Design a protein around this ligand. Sequence first.
Ligand SMILES: [Cl-]
Ligand SMILES: [Cl-]
Lengths: 296, 296
Amino acid sequence: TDPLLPGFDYLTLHTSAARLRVAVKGSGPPLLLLHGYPQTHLAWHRIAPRLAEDYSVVLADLRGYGESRALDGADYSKAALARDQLETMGQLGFERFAVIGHDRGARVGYRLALDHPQAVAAFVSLTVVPILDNWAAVNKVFALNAYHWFLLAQPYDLPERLIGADPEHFLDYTLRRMAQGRDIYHPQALESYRRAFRDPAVRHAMCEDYRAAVGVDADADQADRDAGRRLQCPVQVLWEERPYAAGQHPLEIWKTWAGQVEGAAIGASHMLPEDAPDAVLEHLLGFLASHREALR
Amino acid sequence: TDPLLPGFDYLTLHTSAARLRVAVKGSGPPLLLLHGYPQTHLAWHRIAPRLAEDYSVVLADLRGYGESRALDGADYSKAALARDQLETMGQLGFERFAVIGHDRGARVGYRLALDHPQAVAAFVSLTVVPILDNWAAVNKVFALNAYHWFLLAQPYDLPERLIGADPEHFLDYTLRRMAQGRDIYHPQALESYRRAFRDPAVRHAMCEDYRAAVGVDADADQADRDAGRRLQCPVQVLWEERPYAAGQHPLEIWKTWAGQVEGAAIGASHMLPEDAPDAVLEHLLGFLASHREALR
Ligand SMILES: [Cl-]
Ligand SMILES: [Cl-]
C-alpha cells in the first residue's frame, strides 16, 4: 500500500479570521483543492500526488472542518471561506490559481470565482451546481435523499444535539450512504474524518455551512443571477452518472453560470475523489493541459 | 384548575394486532377522537369533556403512541391504525360513528373513511389534508419547516438513534415549536407526553408512522384518487390561520376528496386542540348538530 500524501508539507496558516490546516507539494502553476462534507483535505489522497508531479498543489481543510478553525459567532458562509482561500493562496505566493472542489468545497470555489474573478484561472466542480439551482429543484424525493440539508440547517442547537450524541455512528452511516456502500475509504483517512467529527466545534461548523446554504449563500447566488454575473474562467464539471431531470443536468446548469464550460459523467458514487480517482485525474489533467494559457 | 378528563373510564382493549389505551365517557351518538404527533389522547382534555355532555366520546392512543402497543415488524400504516379504530368502536358497541382527528389522527381518520365508508358518519380534520396533496407541495420552505417529515422517514434505525439520545430535549423542543412558543400544555398532560416519548418503542412507532406517510399511505391515497373514490360523509376541516399557496387551501383540497365539505380558519397554532379549544368546540358542536341526521 502506498503512503498518504507522500512529500506533502503540512502547514498551519494564520489569517485574519481563521487558523487553517494546509498541505502543499509541487512546482508549476498553482491548484487549490477543496474537499467537502463530512471530510477533510485527505479526501484528495488518490489525486493530489499525481497532480503535484506537474503543478503546485495546495490542499486545505475548510474553515471549521478537519483541523481548520475560526478564530471567533464566526461566519461560515461560502463568501467567508472564499476569502480564506484568497488569503491562503496569497500567503503561499499565489495571486491567481486554479480551483478544484468537491461537494462543499466546490461551493466555496464557485463563490470565490464569482466574488474574486481576478484570482481564479480555472474552476472544476466535482458533483456540484450552484445552491440556487439546488433549491429550485426541491421536491419529495430530493428532500428524502438529502434530508440532512434540511436537518443540519435547523436553528442552533437542534442538529448539533442530535448528531452529537453518537458522532461516530452518524459519521460512519453518512460516509457509507454517500459511497453507496462501496469500500472506498482508506482506513487511515477514515480515522482522520472520525476524529474531526468527534469535535463538537467541527459538527457546529458543518451545521453553520448548511445554515449558510439556505440563507446567505443562496442570496449571494441570486444577486449574481440578478446582475448577470458569470464565472469568467474556463469551467469543468464532473458529475455522478445518474438521471437528471430536465433543467437539472449539471452541464446545462453550468452553461447558465459561465460562458466556457465542459464536463463529463463518471460512473461512481457521489464521492468522486476517493471512488474514481483515475477517471477524475484523466479529465483534470486534460482540462488543465488544454487551458494551459489560462493558467499563465 | 379543573381536573383532567373528569368521569372518563380508562380501558385497555385487546384486538387482533394491538393492545390499545382507550378512555370513554358519555351517552348519545358516538364520536372517536384521534390525537396526533408527538402526543397522546390527553391532547383532547379541553374538548372531550364538553362533547361528552351530548355524545358518546371515545379517546384512543394511536397504535404505538402513548400507552397503545402493537402485539408484533408491526404495520404502522394509516390503513392498519384505521382497522384498530373499527375494532375499538365495534368492541364498545358502535358499528358507525363520527371521527374527529388532529394531525396524525386526522390521517388515520380519513383513511378509515375511505376504506370503510359504512363506518364513518361524519369526519372532522384539524389541520390536515391528505398526504398525497402534502407531497405534491414539497419545496424548499416546506422541507425546512417540516424537516422532521424527512428525518423520521429515513431507514431504520437512523432517526431512532438521533431522537433517542436525549428524548425529552427533542420532545420539548418539538412541542414548543409546534405551539409557536405559546403556553398551551397542561403540565400534567406534558408529563404523559414525555413519558411516552422516553419509551424507545414509542419513538420507533412514530418513525414508522412517518415512513408509512412517504410510502404505503401515499400509495393508498393515489389509488383512491385513481379510482375516483371520495369520502361519503359530511366533512369539516378546521385549519390554522396562515397563508396557503394556490391549490393548497385546506377547504379547496378537501372539496377534491369529498362532495360535502365545510370549514373554518382558527387563529391559533397548529396545536388546535390545546391552543383553541373553545373555537374548536363552537365549530364542532355546530357541525355535529347540523348533521344530526347523518349520525342516525
Ligand atoms: Cl454539496
Ligand atoms: Cl400531520
